[model samples]
Target chain A: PIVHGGGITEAAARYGGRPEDWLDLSTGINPCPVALPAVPERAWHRLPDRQTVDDARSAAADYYRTNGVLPLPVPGTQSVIQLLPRLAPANRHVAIFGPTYGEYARVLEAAGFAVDRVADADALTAEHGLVIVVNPNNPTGRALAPAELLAIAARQKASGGLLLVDEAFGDLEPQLSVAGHASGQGNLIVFRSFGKFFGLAGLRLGFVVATEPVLASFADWLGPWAVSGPALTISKALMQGDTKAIAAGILERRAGLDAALDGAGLNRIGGTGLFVLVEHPRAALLQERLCEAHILTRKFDYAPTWLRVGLAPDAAGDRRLADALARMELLEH
Target chain B: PIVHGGGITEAAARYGGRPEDWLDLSTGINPCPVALPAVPERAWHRLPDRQTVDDARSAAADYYRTNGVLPLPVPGTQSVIQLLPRLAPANRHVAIFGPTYGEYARVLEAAGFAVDRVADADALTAEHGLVIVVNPNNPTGRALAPAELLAIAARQKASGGLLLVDEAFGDLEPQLSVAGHASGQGNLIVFRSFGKFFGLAGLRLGFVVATEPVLASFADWLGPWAVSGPALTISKALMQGDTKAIAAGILERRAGLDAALDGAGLNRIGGTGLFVLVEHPRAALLQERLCEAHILTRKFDYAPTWLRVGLAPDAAGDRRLADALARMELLEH
Candidate 1:
């Protein structure tokens, strides 16, 4: 299994602390989750009706600003990622703009597709049948303008290829998204993460925005009730609710994270509203020291000098993280 | 799309009644769902961790009495059914015991596998590469003994084929389950539905009990966090909780349904504890009349004479259904 954020249980066992006591900052998820609506008893009891699923999809289309194209809700974006390989022939070459969320390449490779890890949009070629980009990227938070991605999509379409933009973190930076433009473009397939932005990752809700034919293929493969009833209910409510407040809250939390990182003399490299990337010569040691202080952050195997720190829930969590980093600096001295 | 039940919304629109007013007896789901435990905030907020998933898997194993084999939790049994076609080669001839869930044939056929609808276990031959049986089957309530299935599994193993037993309705007849026998046989794969029995079909949780390699393939295909956090939490609690009471409630409801059917001069042809199948010469008309009275019953396309009536929640519901049937009988006369 790929090393992911939010392995607090495993960290507790290995690093000597109760999992609950740890300030988990490994994932780029909104710490202040949207207040859960009262799910009707029927939502938990009955099979998810077509109207309910359709309502959620409509709400997702509105939320993602997809105009008229309704996004297909899967269990998670990860679930859809597993099916991407089947979207194209195995002989087709897959190109991923990385290093981002590892699953895109991993899933493709496992499905017998030859995957090339390219550095940027410039590296994409006519020969690449399927191209992937994680806009407002994970860990690094690297983002591309919509025009750049749209041009790539147009190029790929002309070449009879597909362009998949993973807007998992696009909730924080909607302007960077191609979701609204994806409906008209046959080749552009956009993935939107509902849980990460709503602070309900455990709900396992995500959306795939694309043309009818592409969405149909995914729907057929995923089958019925691919998402839970409560998940659909909650997501529909939240998507149609006051999302401006949620976005502001995430921005505020990001500010607190920024202040803490600045105070600790950590050089901010890149990131979105939910997380910040920092570079340290002794990053592995810093990760260990933070672990000792019962705070968890994400470290990358491929990038040795970088650490990705997710937003703390509040100012107190910020203070705790800052104190840990300060104490670690003293130990290094 | 295949017209599986719990479509009260569509029915309400067609039948000219409020959707909420419809007594949905269309699905074989328990009317009285297990009492939901207080889910921790973390379950909704944080991504589902490995420990929680493992805990739920262990609980399922215990509940299903799988002896030692751990079952893999999926979004739904339907989701797993979609993936079953990918388990074997396209050239493999699939044999399904007659007129079961339409999805098995539909999905396999969509995946380019030639599917044979066989009448009995005797029809399973060495030429068949994959075999499927839904124990205490849907609509018809057909069941095969464990030894009978085991012999088939052994034969399939020797013939280099696989046996897939879908126990979606097996919770009502635990004695007929081959889950305990699945571990010792490499060729046998058992599918168990967590939602059907617990009366929480909206939860969208099910299990696949098979050997390690088979389970690993599904786990990989499903990717990470296939089951939602709240789903994992709830299923674990319910599986470990007083299932006997839940089973008793379903049995009570089933008895109520049988009594109502008997009073209405409807002959019970077959069924499991959650539902009863009655054969009326005008089954489609019976379904329509029930719908007009704001009651929904399942009518199968394959079995025109069969109307599968699911259990009502209480005596009041049973009386409502019985009165509706009596009124329909008066109109017929």
Candidate 2:
């Protein structure tokens, strides 16, 4: 019986609602989604629209300052992540770090590529056939420094091993990610997500930056018209948007999440980017009480025996979450 | 160099404008696109969102219901159409009427399937392999009767052949389309375009209806989260739209086109649904004359002997086109 969904439908069910109807807090995202501008109708009803799609990529390249460098878009991180296992050289085993994004393992197994298990980023070097790491690692929310990732990528490339960095949470983390140097690293591939920090989870958009040859080869497998008309249109708008403001807002939200959790007297474990993971033997009980009041928070019994609560939309939401926690403690008494 | 694009890119080097700037008539779409609806802010920043996507699909699906059937959303017909050639067992030839929707042949050929072509639907079943027909065939605009298709489908079932109907123009002639029985027919796959008739060619949405088995196979290739957030949102709105009214309006517009062309002293020869073929022997010469006057029309020098003039979006467009034709006729005299 799950209270908040992570792996399956049971989570939302335990909370007496479906994922579609819930105010989901299990994933780290800004609940306050920025209103998207009106899209061009031609973006959807037309086949092979050129302008919106190009503006989207061009804007992205400009946002990331990736001109003449990063190659192409890959539907979103899921598509890019799934394709990683297939891109590795034949007979090479995939070596992935644990308790992270499930798609890394799921896609590898589905593609019939066997993956190796590694402890953390340090172990993900050339000795392994193919190595992958999720920077600002999911749930735990820790970012790998550029030097750390570049070291792993260098080792892997020397062995003709492919190194993939899932920078899915990069935008939420203030750091130098491997995404910018994707092409220069040759065998190093980086995945950039357009969701998390921007708060556009519904529109799945991600760019794949790898060695030009590798990107092209993967392109053949992914095929054309991979992005939907709307996703491409809206995503281009997101990419074209200002970066400084978004990053500052995320930092502000992160600090607020910390203060709210502290004020509620909840003993917390990990997470620094877009959320804070907390430990309470009373965590599950807290979750249940909140659900009773229609407040949803993510739970993970496996990592640190804690509940991972995502950051709320703004200072107002942060206050509401603290209030929800206060109500949960009163119910426990 | 290409004034119109596709064929003349290399040959028309003398035109001297960039390909992007062309008042592109290579595609049969309205140049004046209506503005798109503002996207919900929540749609952009949320990761792994299902509500907006579902709402989008519902909007489209609700609109696609006609003759007691619901339309299943596809990201774009390009990928779905590509799936067709792969669905057939190896070495099996797919039948396509010659010089029709090029994708039928393009998808099949790309998949390494040899195509068996027929010129007409009279003995469509008599031909071997998978049968594909576009309603109001592209370029020629010849439409086959819905009964003729249902009859051919029955023949295919008995003879162990498959028939795919691309009802891209079915919105313009709903009464004569076999798309209604699409789900019930085991060997028939029906494709309806949201691209063309909606005048949103760049948006790239379509609907697929077929028996459960075929859809199951498509799932493997398309994957979950196949349709985009915006496509789902807008399509849901469109699918719930009034088909009866849309159908009437499209037919009326198409009819108005013929009258305007006749008034312009242009001969209507090769056409099916929304266009009339101008069989002016010097059709290419006339094409340039219209271009000089800033009027765009499609030329199929592939059929070097003929040119195609697609119908205008509205009465004003018809008048402008008629004026272009009248100017071209002056040169002919």
Candidate 3:
């Protein structure tokens, strides 16, 4: 299985920590979830109505500020990532900016596409059929400017290639997303995740901002009622609710994470408010110490010496992480 | 979009009936939904855990009697139907028993397969690459015995073809289902729907009973947490709970529908307990007349003269339908 964050049950089982007691800092999702309203009986008893789907889409488009690009609700961004290789024309060599989410390479390869991993997003060329960029990239949170993205998309559109920008964390940094420029750009597609910022991964809600034809094709592929009813219910409420302070709250949490790791003698690499990446000489050892203290941090298969730690959920978690980092500092002395 | 039942919203919007007031005798689903328990906060906050998925699967295995066949839970049976053509070897002649669910043929053709429609499940031959049969079938409710299904599967297996038996209505007639015999049959696959019997189509949970290899391929294609956490929670409870009396209730309801339509001199053709199919020269006229009374029944694209009516939800709905039919009888005379 591909390594990912938020597998606290597995971590707790393996490391002897009760799942309920552990401070899990593995995934870059909000720790405090938005309040879920009572699910309507119709939402559970009947097929999802067309208006519910359309209203949710319109609300998402309004929130994301999609410039006429259809906001398609899918199970999650992972649904988009997996279906993308099949939705577009096949057999062109795919270029992905690394290090990034590993599913892109795996899915592309499974679709019989030759995949090329490069260190820079701008390094992609017309020779490639597909160029994928994960803005506010996973683990190492590197974001590309919108103008740069527009230029890249324009180049790809001219050359008959497609540009896919996965902005799963764009909710925390809206200015970095390309959905604002995605209108009428048939070759440009942007993916947005509701689970990350909303802290409702279990709800499995996300959106794809793309042109009319592409969105229609995606809709056909996903079939009827592609998303669960509860997900749709919770997502509509959360998206339409007042979440203006959410981004600011995330920024504060990111600083708290930085402070928590200050004495560990680890160098900060890059990340968003949800998570921070650190480069320590013995990154694995630090992760092990945290796990021993019943704290879980994320490790990457591609980068063994880099550990990505999400912000602690509460003050108790913050204290636990800080104390764990202090013990690591003493070991360094 | 393919036409389906349980679309009271569409019926209400198009025909000017209040959705809440309409007796939706359209889809062959349980009218009384299973009692829903309080949803756990973790189910909404965290990603669906592996343990949760496994527990649901095991419960389903016991319920469906999938002895050696691995039971794979998907977002819905629709998920399996849409992806099956691609997951298996591609570009073969797909044969579907007609006058049934339309999605099987549509998805198979969309995946570039040459599709052929046949009138009888037994008429399928080795010449065709895949055969789809909806057992205790929709609308007509024509069911094949287990031995007959086994023979058909054996013939397909001999020719390197496969049989897809969609048991969406299997819960109403367990004696006619092939899931118990699905084990060790590489060429036979059966699908089960939780939404129909549980009366929670919006929950979006279903399973595929197949061999280990096929189940693994499906799991990989769907990616992680394909089923929502809430769906997993509810499905686990519903599958494990006692529902033996539910089948008897459906049988009683089926008889009630027959009695209601008898006064109209409509000939009852066939159906499971969840619904009854009737034949009349003025089937469309009857449907229209019922709509005027704020009642809804299923119509067919292939068989315009045949109208399928689902059981009324409660005693009040049954009285409403009976009264509507009495008016229709007067109009007929």
Candidate 4:
């Protein structure tokens, strides 16, 4: 778990490149970020106010289109991932749709829950008491259809099992998010991450949209001021801004990245606007070549030929990545 | 457990005072803060680096004189308080020294651990598997000598129980801290808070010093990027700065406060430099009167006659409080 993406320094050290020189495509973070407001003096010194937390929650609810769903703002989606096993009904086995976020399997196993890493939504049955699906999933970028997800939720509804949908990259594909269904849907719990789309990962902001009973437990467990004042302030501001413009930019950026990789003869599988997963027979050689050129893409232990490439943040970044790949493609021929 | 001391907004809302207007003496937080450094831009964009985390931990270890103790920086002591119940050995009962932090008992009870609110160290036995003691304790100001605490630790060592000493106020009273003993001692665990003394509660930074096994469990549970980049940055800056002046001033401030309260016929029962707990038969009425004058102090629900007064942060705050108390004493006559 310590060996995650975005270790730019470690990547630099190994590749014989300077940290600043590397084009870090390891993480699925927005290159063009929403502007963070100037932090107030009290945000640094005083304890986070209840009113502030409530305000941020309300704003996020509006942004996520979950008017009736009670949004519990946490430190991050990672915190929610850790708490999920403890909150679930005892003796319930967990079924995760993968290959996806590794934390789902790792956290569940640690919490003593029997975890089954099923490949698709069909495997989530009555026996799998808790089902987790990462919509527009990480690395692979495979998204389950909304109706397909709803059918799964309906299946779990009768079983009295909970379905947690991680919509960490739902900004570009809002229609797929289960946040809108959370209010009337008792079994559906949706997670939204502010860091990936907003590019303020260090600010540490995420939300859990669920029913009162589950959220009440979360509120009690996290206690007061679990989210920092800066995080609260920044989230409110970001959530209030126009999402349409941000979504368009993400689409444009992703398209440019896909075209560039496609031109370079890399076969694209699937991915969100934030990142793309591509396959090549000489993947490890390509990765080593890219690293030598100071371009870092995510490598999976479970899938050796698969490399997850984050979108180029800007034109300079895109140019650098294209140049690196061009040299690698020439060597391949 | 929702009931806590520092709800300045709620206090102001109920008592007819603006939040900014009230001289907030509700929480035991240092009004004087350590200088905050200019945060790096990468701290906002990039996930927290391992080097930064290690650097901060090393700095904290030096500051706490816990060179032997492995100081694991957490989000706050409250985070550890929430985690400990689950982290402990199963089927063990918890013995908490009271009336202490409400959270200690509540979290343990929620986690299915039987917790007893024992009054003194002498009452802790082998049967009480986990012992929690708040040093320079909140609201009461009662402090157990290091020898008394060490004896308690010795008792728990053989019995396979743990002694969790919460040194939330240890910055002003370093001699009372058990942090130094945590390295060699397997049974002793120490909790330390950076927010109280540094006056940055919004930052939500804390540390747990224990043997690697317990600390490893915490690492697994909390996961990576648990502490924010800004928190790591601020902590390193604060630890590098001079503390002797701040420590010296706290002593003077506490002495002056005690003298002023004594002159007003309010005897200080106990407290750390940050706050004092005083018992008066008319404490509730006096608290209401002080509220009318826009001066806030803490009143305990468990102890009817006891009122906890946090020290005035500045000379201006002291003058206003003294003037309010002078008027109240005259009315008593």
The best candidate by lDDT is 1
Choose the strongest candidate by TM-score.
Answer: 1
Each model's lDDT: 0.89, 0.65, 0.81, 0.82
Instruction: Give the per-residue lDDT digits (tens) of candidate 3, residues B159-211.
Output: 88888899999897788888977665678889999888988888788899887
Flag regions of model 4 displaced more than 4 Å. Answer: A328-333, B248-256, B328-333
| Candidate 4 local lDDT, B194-249, one digit each (tens) | 88888788888899898888888887788878988888888887788888887777
- The lowest-lDDT stretch of 10 consecutive residues in candidate 3 chain A is A324-333
Clash number for each model: 0, 42, 0, 2
Instruction: Report the C-alpha lDDT of model 4 over A13-63, residue by residue, as the tens digit.
Output: 788867777788888988777777767776776788776788899998889
The residue-level lDDT of candidate 3 at A299 comes to 84
Give the lowest summed-lDDT range of ten residues in model 4 chain A: A324-333
Taking the tens digit of each residue's C-alpha lDDT, what string does model 2 give over B1-333? 112322223323445455343333445553334345555544445443345544654454444443444455665676687677557656666778767766667667767887877787564544456888886677677778878788788887877788888877666666667766765666788887665666666554677767657766665555555555555655556556555565566567668778887887667776745456777777778777766555556776466657776655678767777776675545553
Provide the lDDT at A302 for model 1: 90
Candidate 3 lDDT, A4-123, residue by residue in tens: 887877887888967888888988888877777667887888877676787788888888988755599998777778887876557578888888988998888888888888876557
The true-structure Cα RMSD of candidate 1 reads: 1.9
**C-alpha displacement of A201 in model 2, angstroms?**
3.0
How well does chain A score by TM in each candidate?
Answer: 0.97, 0.86, 0.95, 0.95
lDDT of 2 at B307: 72
Docking class of 1: high
lDDT of 1 at B139: 71
